[PDB]
Structure formats: C-alpha cells, structure tokens
Scaffold this active site. Structure first.
Site, PDB file in Angstrom:
ATOM      1  N   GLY A1398      33.151  34.564  34.817  1.00  0.00           N
ATOM      2  CA  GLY A1398      31.868  35.075  35.266  1.00  0.00           C
ATOM      3  C   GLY A1398      31.776  36.588  35.252  1.00  0.00           C
ATOM      4  O   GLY A1398      32.790  37.281  35.179  1.00  0.00           O
ATOM      5  N   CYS A1399      30.550  37.094  35.342  1.00  0.00           N
ATOM      6  CA  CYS A1399      30.269  38.512  35.133  1.00  0.00           C
ATOM      7  C   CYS A1399      30.956  39.450  36.123  1.00  0.00           C
ATOM      8  O   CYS A1399      30.903  39.246  37.334  1.00  0.00           O
ATOM      9  CB  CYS A1399      28.757  38.751  35.182  1.00  0.00           C
TER      10      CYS A1399
END
Lengths: 1488, 64
Positions: A1398-1399
């Site tokens: 994830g970011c």
C-alpha cells in the site's frame, strides 16, 4: 472648589462686618450665612481638610460674640448649637448639651471658650435659676468638662464665676468656693473685686448664702476642690457651713438599704471619706430591686467629687461582676430599665476617673445584656459607648482593636437591617480623629471592609450616613457591587476608586492633593496592565523613584498600604516585562529607604535577585543569595515571605548547575524547615491567594529541575518534570478563583517556560513527532493571548524551531509576526528582548552595540555579552566562561578549531585536492604546508574530539561530532601511520552509530513510561548505550556470518557520501568518503527525487484520478507518469555513474579466491613497478608503499565484458595513485604510461575472471541513515540482483540477530496463525477482487487464522493480530495507522513479520535537523523482525501484479527468501521505477 | 488506456504524548483576564469575658 470657599468666606466677611455696623439688616439675612457656614463645613469634612475647620470656627465664633454685643441673644444661642453640631459627632438640642460636652480632638481648640460663650448668654438672658442644676453639675466635675484646655482663658472664666455668684438667688456659697479656688489655682489678683478676700470668705457663711435648697448634694464636690487647693491656710471649714448635728449624726446613722429610694441617691449628702468604706463593704455582701439600690449608691458617688480611690474601685469591680453574673435572672422589663440605668452611671464614673480598661468591662456587660435579652436597644447603647471611648481616648492604634470589637457586635444583631444600623456607628467621619494621612484612612476602611462590611451582605449601593467621600471611595473600592455613582466624587477620589477596581472610565482643597502624584501613577500603572501594554511603565517608574520615593524623609510620613501594594505590583510588572535596569534602580532605592519601606524590602530583594539573573549579573546575584540565605530564617517567617525567599533561589545559575545540590535544598532542606511550601493539596487550608502562590512555587521548581536534569544527561526525568509542572498549572487554573494579576503574570511566564523547555528537550533527542505537537499546542495558546512580551518571546522561539525543522514557509511567517510583535514593547528598557530581535534580523554589530549602551560601565559584571558570543558561534576563554555554559563553549571551540585548520590546509593545493578525492581509511599497509605540522594539528584535533562528554550533545551535534571524528581519522591515516590504527576505526565505527541508535532508543523508552509518574509530586545514560553500541559491533564481527554490512550515510560538513563495510567472515573493516561534486550534489539529487515523488504522488490521489474520465485525458495521465518514470531512471543513472563509478565493487557480493589473488597481487605490483615514475627512478622495492588487499580486490571485481570497463578501471587507478600520493609518492600523470596500465591490467583481470572460483556472500545488510532513506538504493544496477534488507543501526541489527541465534535466513512457519487485512476502506475494489479468492482459501485450511475484508478494523483487533501471528499482511493505504495509534504498536515487544503493501507505508516525513519518522520505524520498535513497505505512493494494477508474484515466488519446495523474491518480482510492473522501485525491506530476510 | 487507481488517503489516529491534557478555552480565558491587584482576599454568638485589675471687649479676646 476654592472659588467655592472664597465665595462663602466672602459672605461670612460681609456678615461679620456689616452686622456690627447695622444689626437689623443682618439678622433677617442670617439664613444666607448659615447656608455658607454649613456649605463649607460639609466640604471640608468631606475632603478631610480638618485644618480649615479650625479657621472656620474662628470666623464663626466671631459671629457669635457680635450677636451677643448687639443683644441678639436668641440667634447667638442657636449659633453656638449650630457650630457644635457641624463639628462634632454628638448633637445638641440646648446650651445644656454644650456645657456637659466632653473634650475630643474635634472640639479641643474651642470647646472651653464656646462654653464660656454659653455661660455669657445664659447670664445675659437671666436664665441662671433654671440652668442652676446643670451649671452646678458643670463645675462639680470641672476637671472633666473645663480643666482640660491648656490655653484656657483663666481671667475670663473666673470673672464669669464671680458674676454668677452675684446674681444667683441660691447656692451662693458654692459659687464662692469655686471662685476662691480658681483665684489661687490660677495665679490671679483678687483686686478684680475693693473689699478684702478674708471678709469675702466670712461673708458667705450667712443664713441666706449657705442656702442651697435641694442642691445641697453638690456641697461636698465643691468643698473638696476648694480645700484640697488651700490646705494649710485660711480654710473655710466644713463645720462653718454645716452644723455638728448634721455632720456627726451621719457617721452614727451609718453604723446602725439605707438609701433615698425616690431620689436615686443615698440617704445622706456630703458623706465622709472613711465612712464611705463601711458603706461600700456593706454592699458587697449581697433579685431585681437590689439593682435599684446599686443605682442610688453609685449615683451619689458621682455627686460627691471624691478623687479616685482604691476602696471605690475595688467595689466597682465587685459591682460589675455581680451585674454580669446575674443578667439572665432579669426577666421583666422594669429590671432591664434599671440595668441600663446603672450601667449608664457606672460608665460616667470611668470618664471622670479616667479608667479606660474598666470602661471596657461595662461595654462587655452591655453587650452580654443585649445578647441574652435579644435587645437591639442594648446593642445600640453598646456600640455608641465604644465610639465614645474612641473620641475620648484619641488613639489611632486603639482604632484597630475597636474594629475587631465591632465585628462581634454586627454578628450579634437580630436582623439584616439591624446589622447595617450598627455598622454606621463605626463607619463614621469622626472616627478619623482629624488624621490627615492616607495610611490611616486605608488601614481603617479596608479593615472595616474585611471584618465588618462583609457581614452586612448587601447587594445595592448604600451611601453610609455621616461618612466622608474618601471613606466611601476606599470602602466601595474593595467591593464588587456593580452600580456605584463614583462620578459624584472628586477626580482624585474617583482615581483611587478606579485603581482599587478593574475599571477605568476617566480641586485644590483636598487631602488627596497631598498624594496627587502617587494616586495618578497607580492609576496609570493599572491602566496599562488592563490594556496589556507598557506605554507608560518606564516613565512612571522613573517618576515614582525621583519625585516621590526619594522625597521620603522630606514628606516624613508612614507609608500607606495603597503605596505598598503598588510597589509590589510595579516590581512585579517590571519583572514580567524584563525592565531589569529599572527593576534594579527601584529595588536598590527601596532598600536605601528602609526607614519607611522596611516592610516591603523582602519584595525588593526578591525582584532585585531576579533582575541580576535576568541580565546574567551572576557575580551580584551570587553575593545576594549568600546574604539572604544566612540572614532570614524560615521557621519563624510568614508563608508569604517564605514563598518569596524560596522562589528567588530557584534559578539555575545560583547553583552552578549542580543538580544534586539543588535537589538537596528544595528536596530535603526546604521541606524539613517549611513543609507548607509544598502542601499542594492545601491540607492546612491556606487562603486561596497563598495556596495558588504555593502551587506556583512548585511549578517554578519543577521547571528548573528540568533545566538541570537535561543539562546533566537525564532526558527522561527532565521530561517528567516538565509534565509535572504543566499538570500543576492545570490544577491551578481549575481552582474556582478569580486569578490575581500577580499570579496570572507569574503563571504565564511559568507555562511558556514549560512549553519552551519541553520542545528544547525533544530537539536534543531529535524527536520531531513530539516537537511538532507541543509546537502546535504553544502556537494555539499564543493566538488568543494578548500579552505582548509573552507573544513576542514565543513567536521568537517558534521561529528558531521552524529553522531547525526547516519549515521555511512557517519560518518566514513567524519571523514577520515576531517582528510586528516587537513594536508592542519598549526596546530601550528591555535589552534581553532587544538582542533577540537584533539576532533574528542578522544585525549582529547592532546587537553588541546595544549591549554596551545598556550596561555602560557595568559591562564588566555581566556574562550577557559573552553569552551572545557563544550564540554567534564564538568560543570564549575558559577562565571567564560561566561553568554552566562550558559545554556550549567546548563545542564552539571544536568547530572553530576545525574551520581554522581546514582553512589553512585548503590553501595548500596538496590538501585542497585531498578533500576533493575519494579517500579510504585502511588504504595502505604501515603556500606549501609542512607535513609534520599537518599531522600535529590533526592529532590535536583528534584528541580534542575525544575529550568532550557525549551526554552534553544534542543528537544532531553528536551526528556532526561523529562525522567530523571520522574525517579526521581518514585524513590522518592517509598522511601517516597513526598509533593504534585498527582500534581507532572500531570505535569510530561505533561512534557514528550512536546518532542512529539514540533517537530510536529514546522513542521506545518515552512511549512505554508509566503515566503515574506525571501525577505524583527508568533513566538512560549515553554511557551505558556507548557500551551497548560498541558491543553490538563486537558481536556482529564475532558471529562469523558470511554477510556484508554496508552503511550508506551523508556528511553534512563535507557533503561527501560516506560508505562503510563490515565483513564478519573476513574480519575486516573498511570505510570510504566520496566527494560527489553530468554532476549533482547530494542535496541536488534529493531535490530532484522529491520533485518526482511529489508529482507522482498527487497523480495517484483520488482527487485527480476521479476527475479524469475522457479517453483523451487518460493519455495525459499516462504520458505524465511515463515521463516521471523516465525522470527517475535517469536520476538513478546519474547517481549510478557519478557517485559510485569505480567503487561499485565495494558492493560486490563476490569473495575473491585466496590462491589466485596472491598471484594477481604479484602481477599488480609488477605493473605499478614498471610504469610508475616514482617506482622506476627512486628508492628500491622494499621502500614502496604497500596498498591494502581490499583495494587490490576492487580490480578483480571489475568486468572487462562490461561496456564502460575502462572508465571504472581508470577511476581505480586514480584512487591507488592518490593513496600513494598522500603517503608521499609523487607520480606526475604526464610521466605515467596509462597505455601499459590499461592493457597490462585488463589482461591480468581477464586471466582471473576465466579461472576464478565463484563463491559469494549470503546476504547484504544496508544500514541506511535516515537522511538517505528516501533513495531507492536497491534499484541501482550493482545492487539490483542482490539479497538486500535495510537496517537503521548496528544495534538494531545485532539485536535482531541475537534474538534469533544468528541463523539466516529467518525461518517462519506458515501452517498456522496468519493475519490479513484486505481493502479496509472499500476503495480498492479491483484489488479486493484478485486477492479475495486466495485469502479466504487460506484461513479455511489455516487454524487460528483471520481475515478482515472491506471492513475498518478496530484498534484492539489488529493489536492482537500483530502480537499473535506468524505472518501479518495488509493491503490498503499506508500501514494502517488510521486504525491503530503509534503508541500501542511501540508498546509491543514482539510483532509478526509484516507485509505493509500500500501507498507510502515505508515513506517518512522529514523535519530538517530533527530525526524523521514513519510507520516503518514504528513496527521495528514493536519487535517486528521483517517489515516490507513502499517508499511512496503506487497504483493498484502494478502493485497487485507485484504482490501476486511476491506471494508466488515466496511460497505463500525450494521457494525464494523475501529478499530474492522482491528483487525478482520488480520486473512485473509496467512502471518499473515509479512502482517497481517503491517496495523496500527493513530487518532480517525470512523464508517460509 | 484504462487508468490504475490508488487508495483514499486516511488521517492517522492523532498522536498525543502520554497523559498530556490540553488547555481548554475556559483555561486560556483565565490566563488573559486582568483582575485588580487591590481586590482583597475572599454564626454562633458568644458572650464577652471580663478583665481583672464679661464686657464686650473680653468676649473678642475670648475667641481671638
């Protein structure tokens, strides 16, 4: 108000002049004069101008006598009464009331002469016969009613007595007895009457002359005063007036009640002296009628003018004791009437005999009678009798006791109205006793407010009767009643009223005019404070000093409490605004005027001490402390003076920064001697004002306890102290109290100090997370606050902070705010703020200029000019330096020494080129600048760097000291062969690890400390961590693991890239410095990388991806991301070819064959021998500088088959040519056959590459410093295909390995207990779809496993996931910090291996010179052995391709480890840099 | 060509140092409110004990 007085004086002069001229006109017009007389009598009484009352009476007395001379006796009589009633408390109905009027200070100057005027009128109207029993009563006690005036008109008084004897129709004997007495007592001639004096004596013994009628009672009182004067002379005997049978039978009737019941007297008149003793004693032996007889007895005792006697006074006490003993036995109201009658005549006796203490008894009997009877009538008689004592006694000191007396009176009144009625007896103008001082007025009104007025419980303005204007102003000044008609009073009165309250809405004949200056500076002071300004603070201070305080002995008067509380507030406000110069002048002045201001000196000493300390006048400050500490003791002092003495000794400079000494005093000594200075719970229930002052003391101590702790290496306890100080400040505010200005100012300074200290502590340890919090908290309080000096000081502090964390936008803003805030304070009086201002705006010359103006010839006694040198970076003489600021001095010296040395070396082209060359430390086997000089200056620099204590350095400075320590060792080991070559590199290795270790350590400790430490009114040392960090390296080296531990760091000083390798298997330590300046510095590469990341990140945001819909805008999106993906590849390529060209072999996992290398080493030295000018022409082979083996190996690790082979080999040539150069082997490149070098080396390298045995290390641990984190190092071509994991420090790594018995790769079971979170916010539908299948299949065949899908997880759900799993994966935004706080993860000791897909899950926010933070470090502190995350924002399709290949290649047989799997999975991404370069691994490599 | 997506940016649960209690507006209000320094510091009845042990010319001269 003078034109008013001159107007009425004009009228009086008209009357008194024209009345004598024409008596008819003035009589009818006397109303106009009575107006004017009363008009000024009121004014002069209201403004307390007693002195003009006297000059008015004179003109008034002159009017009376001219009415008598013109026989207007009627008017003259009512004028005597008019004069009396205007200038006395007591009132008069007739001339009878004037004649029996007591002497008080209000009528001292006219009462006797007024009485003589009265007798003149009584005579001229022929009213002697009717006034007879009052005139006889008058002269009977002449010692009381007349003989008190020292300037008594003698000849006029006796002449009156004689004329009354002439016209009287009775008692002609009594008037003659007094006349003969007044003639001999006042030496006077008898020739104011031709007949002789002897015949005059006998002429009074006639039948008609001795006739006294019923006034025979007074006979004894006259005879006594006559004969006692005339003893031993021609004395008119008693047996001349009274016959034998009437004097002898008196004695005989007594021996055999016995009082005239109907006449309130005894049966006999003119009782003998000794015969009275048998009468008094007989009465002591004794329902209600018994009181009646007690009246008759004492009534006669008054009528008999017998001098004070013991037998009389002894019976007096027996009488009043019997009275009080049986008050309750009185039931009916006739017996109560007798009680008031007896207590009345008994009190009259006291005034005659002048017995003030015996009068006090009678007052107590009246009071007791009032309470028992529940009679307000008695209580009014009690109050009025006390006030009678006040006037008669004429003491200002007694007036304090009578106020306390009246307090008991008011509390006993039977109703609210009765209470106010009693009060008005006290609050009366004539209680001033003609006192013309401000001190007495204030003492009286404030006392009457505390003890009396607050018992009245009134909520409306009551204009108390017969009280002055000044009295109402002071009294209601201390009230809280809203609507008070102050506008009626004089401006001077209003000015006191306003100062006494918090509101400011703004005559030559006035008492307050004598204090005009003082009154208006108090008004101006309080006016400024309410506006939160200091516009007049300077002017009024100098004004008070020169025009009042110095005229102390001239005025010669006791100082009011009005002035006292002003001084205490002025000193305070001056202190709060740092007007330290004025504080000193004022405090020293007060201490000089001890004669009057001695009671306020303990305040002057407190603020003088704090003044010296504020200006860093430590010499004076230290002298003052030792004086104070030995003079005054605590065991007997009041809590207020004790608080003040202790509060002044709290400053750090008074203790030589000796924490143990400070702790002994405020911890053991002070509490043992004065415990209630530490009673923060108010167990002894102090007044709310004092209690807050106690709480303020402990706040100030904790705040200072923090400064000493942090300047002693006790960061933890320093934090705890600051938290205690703020918790007390909270409990202080929540006390239900109207915070006094004094305590508000004190708390403002303490609270801001608390915030300042907290931030400075977290700056020292580099915690940006906490600094950012307290910064915002502080920044919020300032907003609503209005105190200029607090606001400026804080804005200035925040500006410094924003410079540290390099928040340039907030930096610019706060600088402007602070600059604008500085206009709002006096730059001339406030030097400490002025210098701060001049410092911020880079005006350094003006800064030291304004210092010498301020101090002048006092500059020798202040450390402040030297202190600003330390702030500017200078180092000062050790002998003149304050012991506390010695650490800062040493640091400045180190940097200054280094700058001067590096400067003198860089002017020699030899060292100029050495700092611009790649340098290694174990490189060789063991104008024109001198060599031995350079070695010497560097060995001195090295020994100085080793001298300083490491626990006195903030983490950023420790970072500089370490990289400056390494640079010195590097330069020195290239120039010569230092002592203890290896041990120096080992320590220097662990030195550079401390700045990596300590911030992470403090972070872990600070989050796990118990909360109970903050509410009760663990520590780490750099020493024990120094051992830990050097032992962590010793353990790594001795583990004999076949790995490389390469650190990548950046040097702030040089700007060089700093690489360091550790080889546990080879037992070898190497380090090299790379001058980076196709060309870009380290900051320029950071700026280019951040620029790409920020653009690529905001293209990722849903804010942008939502608004794109058209096919044509899909192209604009992809074209931009295509470009960003190229911009980074080229960036990594520039880094790849500029910073590391030729030294990439430093990262090669290949280990050379020992048997082959020794063969290559022969050929290598052969090639150098034949082609190097210095080895061809000078010395012999046994004098050639030998190159270390790891450098020789760098050639073997080159690949001739690569395209840029010659470029890399050529750079190694220079590196070797430089090793030789610096050690003293010159080789002009003009004379070097690089052709042969190129060919002969390429040949020998190829001969190795075709016969070499291909063995290599198992794993590579990158120790990436926090400033190098944002770089995707694992995507450089020489690191691309390696097994790599990142690590924050040697200690962190060694812990992770020691935890798992040094077995790599870490094995982790996968058959049970696996946690997984998928699409927690439902914003990744496409992502959810691909993984939805596999995840649920696992938890179906995996016991004790769990999945949270399309569902926001609760905090206590994943907290047990992290701690009770063998594997934890997470697919969403970030690392799930929006579902769990940082605190709780950091509270764990063990955490499952985490896959933070994830970011930006591995991204960090940077804060300048402070350490950055991210969720990546949060997991590591929790116990996580392996955490995988993304350095920036990624898109779903590419990252999910990655995630899929990651899980497959890892086996989530002979599956791959997490390191290889990731490196072999980066290629699946379409954007191989914008997405593929994002994932990263911290910790140990694992395998399922 | 279709566009790849990214998750919605979330706010991390607010950090407060252990046991810290912020100053509310009621507290800041008490900090900036000026009160007068001269403001002074904020029923059975017992009895009281006893202690143990002329011509017109002389008139003017009278007032002048």
């Amino acid at each position: 108000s003078i034109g008013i007085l001159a107007m009425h004086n004009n009228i009086i002069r008209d009357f008194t002049k024209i009345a004598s001229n024409n008596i008819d006109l003035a009589i009818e017009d006397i109303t106009t004069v009575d107006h004017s007389l009363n008009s000024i009598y009121s004014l002069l009484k209201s403004h307390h101008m007693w002195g003009h009352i006297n000059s008015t009476v004179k003109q008034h007395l002159m009017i009376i006598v001219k009415l008598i001379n013109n026989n207007a006796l009627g008017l003259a009589s009512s004028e005597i009464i008019f004069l009396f009633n205007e200038t006395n408390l007591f009132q008069a109905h007739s001339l009878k009331n004037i004649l029996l009027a007591d002497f008080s200070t209000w009528n001292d100057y006219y009462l006797s002469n007024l009485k003589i005027l009265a007798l003149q009128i009584i005579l001229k109207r022929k009213l002697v016969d009717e006034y007879l029993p009052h005139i006889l009563e008058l002269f009977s006690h002449d010692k009381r009613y007349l003989l008190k005036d020292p300037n008594l008109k003698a000849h006029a008084l006796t002449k009156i007595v004689l004329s009354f004897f002439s016209v009287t129709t009775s008692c002609k004997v009594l008037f003659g007895l007094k006349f003969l007495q007044y003639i001999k007592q006042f030496k006077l001639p008898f020739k104011k009457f031709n007949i002789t004096v002897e015949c005059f004596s006998k002429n009074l013994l006639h039948k008609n002359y001795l006739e006294m009628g019923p006034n025979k009672i007074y006979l004894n009182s006259f005879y006594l005063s006559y004969s006692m004067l005339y003893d031993g002379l021609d004395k008119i005997m008693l047996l001349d007036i009274l016959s034998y049978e009437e004097t002898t039978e008196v004695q005989r009737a007594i021996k055999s009640e016995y009082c005239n019941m109907s006449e309130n007297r005894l049966l006999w008149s003119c009782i003998s002296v000794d015969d009275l003793n048998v009468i008094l004693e007989n009465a002591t032996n004794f329902i209600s009628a018994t009181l009646k007889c007690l009246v008759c007895l004492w009534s006669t005792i008054r009528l008999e003018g017998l001098p004070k006697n013991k037998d009389i006074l002894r019976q007096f006490d027996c009488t009043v004791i019997y009275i009080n003993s049986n008050i309750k036995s009185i039931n009916d109201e006739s017996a109560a009437a007798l009680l008031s009658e007896l207590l009345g005549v008994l009190s009259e006796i006291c005034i005659d005999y002048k017995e003030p203490k015996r009068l006090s008894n009678i007052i107590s009997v009246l009071f007791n009678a009032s309470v028992l009877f529940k009679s307000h009538s008695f209580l009014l008689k009690t109050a009025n009798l006390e006030i009678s004592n006040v006037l008669i006694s004429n003491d200002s000191k007694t007036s304090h006791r009578t106020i306390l007396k009246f307090e008991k009176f008011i509390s006993s009144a039977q109703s609210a109205q009765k209470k106010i009625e009693i009060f008005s007896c006290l609050f009366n103008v004539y209680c001033m006793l003609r006192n013309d001082t401000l001190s007495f007025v204030f003492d009286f009104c404030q006392n009457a407010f505390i003890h009396c007025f607050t018992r009245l419980k009134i909520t409306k303005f009551i204009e108390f009767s017969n009280s002055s204007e000044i009295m109402l102003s002071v009294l209601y000044g201390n009230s809280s009643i809203e609507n008070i008609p102050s506008e009626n009073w004089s401006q001077l009165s209003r000015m006191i009223f306003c100062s006494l309250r918090g509101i400011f809405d703004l005559d030559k004949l006035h008492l307050l005019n004598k204090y005009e200056l003082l009154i208006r500076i108090v008004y101006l002071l309080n006016l400024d404070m309410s506006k939160h300004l200091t516009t007049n603070l300077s002017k009024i201070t100098k004004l008070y000093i020169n025009k009042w305080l110095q005229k102390s002995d001239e005025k010669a008067e006791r100082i009011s409490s009005f002035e006292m509380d002003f001084v205490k507030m002025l000193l305070c406000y001056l202190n709060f605004n740092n007007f330290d110069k004025l504080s000193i002048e004022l405090s020293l002045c007060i201490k000089s005027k001890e004669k009057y201001y001695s009671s306020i000196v303990p305040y002057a000493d407190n603020y003088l001490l704090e003044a010296y300390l504020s200006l860093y006048m430590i010499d004076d400050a230290l002298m003052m402390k030792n004086q104070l500490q030995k003079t005054m003791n605590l065991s007997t002092a009041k809590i207020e003076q004790a608080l003040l003495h202790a509060s002044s000794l709290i400053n750090v400079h008074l203790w030589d920064s000796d924490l143990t000494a400070f702790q002994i005093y405020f911890g053991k000594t002070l509490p043992a001697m004065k415990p209630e200075l530490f009673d923060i719970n108010n167990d002894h229930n102090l007044p709310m004002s004092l209690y807050i002052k106690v709480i303020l003391l402990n706040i100030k101590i904790f705040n200072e306890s923090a400064k000493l702790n942090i300047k002693a290496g006790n960061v933890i306890s320093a934090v705890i102290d600051c938290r205690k100080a703020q918790n007390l400040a909270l409990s202080l505010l929540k006390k239900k109290n109207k915070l006094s200005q004094g305590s508000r100012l004190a708390l403002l300074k303490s609270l801001s100090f608390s915030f300042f200290q907290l931030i400075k502590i977290h700056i020292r340890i580099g915690s940006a997370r906490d600094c950012e919090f307290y910064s915002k908290e502080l920044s919020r309080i300032i907003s609503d606050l209005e105190e200029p000096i607090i606001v400026y000081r804080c804005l200035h502090f925040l500006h410094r902070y924003y410079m540290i964390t390099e928040q340039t936008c907030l930096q610019n803003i706060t600088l402007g705010k602070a600059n604008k805030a500085f206009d709002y304070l006096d730059a001339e009086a406030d030097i400490t703020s002025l210098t701060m201002f001049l410092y911020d705006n880079k005006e350094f010359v003006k800064l030291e200029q304004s210092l010498v103006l301020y101090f002048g010839d006092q500059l020798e006694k202040t450390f402040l000019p030297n202190l600003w040198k330390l702030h500017l970076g200078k180092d000062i003489d050790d002998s003149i330096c304050l012991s506390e600021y010695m650490p800062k001095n040493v640091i400045n010296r180190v940097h200054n020494m280094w700058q001067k040395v590096m400067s003198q070396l860089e002017e020699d082209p030899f060292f100029k080129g050495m700092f611009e060359s790649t340098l290694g430390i174990p490189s060789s086997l063991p104008q024109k600048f001198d060599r031995i000089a350079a070695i010497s200056k560097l060995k001195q620099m090295k020994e100085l760097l080793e001298s300083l204590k490491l626990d006195t350095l903030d983490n950023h400075e420790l970072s500089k000291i370490s990289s400056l320590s390494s640079l010195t060792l590097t330069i020195l080991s290239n120039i010569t062969s230092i002592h203890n070559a290896e041990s120096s590199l080992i320590t220097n290795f662990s030195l550079t690890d401390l700045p990596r270790h300590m911030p992470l350590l403090f972070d872990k400790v600070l989050n796990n400390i118990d909360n109970k430490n903050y509410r009760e009114f663990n520590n780490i040392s750099t020493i024990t961590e120094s051992i830990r960090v050097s032992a962590a390296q010793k353990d790594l080296m001795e583990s004999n693991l076949n790995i490389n531990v390469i650190t990548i760091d950046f040097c702030p000083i040089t700007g060089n890239l700093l690489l360091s390798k550790l080889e546990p298997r080879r037992k070898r330590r190497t380090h090299l410095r790379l001058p980076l300046i196709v060309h870009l510095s380290f900051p320029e590469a950071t700026k280019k990388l951040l620029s790409i990341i920020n653009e690529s990140n905001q293209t990722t945001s849903v804010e942008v991806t939502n608004k794109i819909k058209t096919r044509e805008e899909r192209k604009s999106w992809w074209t931009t991301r295509y470009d960003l993906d190229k911009r980074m590849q080229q960036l990594l390529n520039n880094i790849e070819n500029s910073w590391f060209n030729g030294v990439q072999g430093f990262f090669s996992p290949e280990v050379v064959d020992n048997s082959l290398f020794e063969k290559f080493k022969d050929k290598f030295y052969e090639i150098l021998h034949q082609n190097l000018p210095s080895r061809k022409l000078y010395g012999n082979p046994a004098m050639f500088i030998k190159v270390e083996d790891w450098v020789i190996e760098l050639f073997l690790k080159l690949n001739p088959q690569e395209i840029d082979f010659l470029s890399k080999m050529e750079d190694l040539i220079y590196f070797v040519l430089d090793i030789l150069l610096f050690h003293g082997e010159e080789n002009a490149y003009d004379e070097i056959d690089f052709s042969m070098l190129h060919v002969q080396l390429e040949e020998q390298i190829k001969k190795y590459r075709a016969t070499m045995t291909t063995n290599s290390i198992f794993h590579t641990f990158l120790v990436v410093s926090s400033s190098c984190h944002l770089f995707p190092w694992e995507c450089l071509s020489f690191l691309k295909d390696l097994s790599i994991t990142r690590v924050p420090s040697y200690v962190c790594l060694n812990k992770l390995l020691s935890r798992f018995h040094y077995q790599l790769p870490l094995q982790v079971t996968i058959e049970d207990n696996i946690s997984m979170i998928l699409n927690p916010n439902g914003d990744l539908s496409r992502t959810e779809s691909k993984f939805k299948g596999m995840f649920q299949k696992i938890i179906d065949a995996k016991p004790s496993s769990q999945l949270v899908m399309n569902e926001k997880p609760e905090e206590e759900t994943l907290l047990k996931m992290l701690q009770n799993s063998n594997l934890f994966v997470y697919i969403g935004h970030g690392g799930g910090e929006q579902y769990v706080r940082s605190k709780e993860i950091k509270k764990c000791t063990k955490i499952a291996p985490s896959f933070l897909l994830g970011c930006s899950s591995a991204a960090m926010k940077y804060y300048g010179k402070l350490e950055p933070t991210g969720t990546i470090y949060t997991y590591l502190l929790g116990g996580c052995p392996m955490v995988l995350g993304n350095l920036w924002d990624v898109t779903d399709k590419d990252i999910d391709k990655f995630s899929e290949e990651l899980f497959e290649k890892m086996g989530f047989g002979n599956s791959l480890s997490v390191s290889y799997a990731v490196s072999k999975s980066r290629g699946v991404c379409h954007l191989r840099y914008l997405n593929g370069a994002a994932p990263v691994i911290y910790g140990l490599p694992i395998k399922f | 060509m279709d566009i790849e997506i990214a998750p919605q940016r979330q706010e991390p649960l607010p950090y407060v140092p252990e046991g810290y209690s912020p100053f509310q507006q009621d507290d800041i209000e008490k900090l900036k409110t000026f009160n007068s320094p001269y403001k002074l510091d904020l029923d059975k009845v017992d009895l009281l004990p006893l202690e143990q042990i002329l011509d017109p010319e002389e008139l003017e001269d009278l007032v002048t």
